[PDB]
Amino acid sequence: VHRVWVETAHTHGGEYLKADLGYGEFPELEPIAKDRLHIFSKPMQLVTEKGKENMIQRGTYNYQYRSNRPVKDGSYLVTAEYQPTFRSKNKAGWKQAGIKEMPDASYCEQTRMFGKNIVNVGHESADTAIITKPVGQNLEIVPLDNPANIHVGERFKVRVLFRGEPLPNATVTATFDGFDTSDRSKTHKTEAQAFSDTTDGKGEVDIIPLRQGFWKASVEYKADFPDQSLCQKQANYTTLTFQIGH
């Protein structure tokens, strides 16, 4: 189960912003395999007051990105995208539903994944103007506060948007680097979460972090594909990564 998230290195004002595209099992960064290169055909983006700009893929490993120019103190976003892929799917094999799960009617599903990291450049940067503005991801987590203001046990409010509109009753989970240290023996399981709740009618939910560290919130949403003459289903997987304390 490979998912997309974004990591940013600790950055000061006046130096280049280094960021990492995570594709795999959080929190372990892995080189993008040959057969997956085509999925990440557009670079990660840096979102500042000037808007969105492409980052440059450079560094030792192919998941490393650098800002075009040095960045000044502020609170910015780094966004990544798994470009849409189509796959054939079929339903079968559940505990006590029934063997004949509509006996093999195959269907198309489009997979999209999105990542977004909140990066605070400068020790005292806690701005909200940039990071609280949606960037247009099909499924999006939008922070409503800067996580630099959130201490352990306090509420960090976020909003889930699907196709530009608030998504009620969506499940948002969250975990941190270090919570789950079991190995690759899962091989079918995502990591354990240290938080879970559902969004309210405004698409909003308060994440309550119980430990400091590097956190990842996750929401996924499966829906009908918009144009049914081309494909039937759409699966969206989105994360928001951020620091609490530390």
Site string for its own copies, 106-145 (x = CB under 8 A): ----------------------------------------
Name residue, tokens 């409010």. 157
Per CB under 8 A, does 96 bind its own copies?
A: yes
Site for its own copies in 2-61 (CB under 8 A): none
C-beta of residue 204 within 8 angstroms of C-beta of residue 144? yes
> Strands 107-121 and 233-244, how do they pair?
parallel
Nearer to its own copies, 94 or 106 (CB): 94
Binding window for its own copies (CB under 8 A); candidates: 17-25, 38-46, 63-71, 222-230:
222-230
Residues sharing a CB contact under 8 Å with residue 146, sequence separation 6 or more, in sequence order: 75, 118, 120, 126, 127, 128, 131
What tokens does 55 get?
Answer: 């980052």
What does the angle CA 222 – CA 226 – CA 230 come to, to the nearest 5 degrees? 105
C-beta of residue 58 within 8 angstroms of C-beta of residue 68? no
Candidate list 194, 219, 240, 244; residue touching its own copies; CB under 8 A: 194
CA separation for the pair 131, 119 (Å, rounded): 9
Nearer to its own copies, 145 or 197 (CB): 197
Q: What is the sign of the dihedral through the CA atoms of 39, 42, 48 and 51?
A: negative
Per CB under 8 A, does 229 bind its own copies?
A: no
Site for its own copies in 164-193 (CB under 8 A): 165, 167-169, 173, 179-180, 182, 186, 188-193
Nearer to its own copies, 38 or 155 (CB): 155
**Which residues of the chain form contacts with its own copies (CB under 8 A)?**
94-100, 155, 162-163, 165, 167-169, 173, 179-180, 182, 186, 188-198, 200, 206, 208, 210-211, 221-224, 226
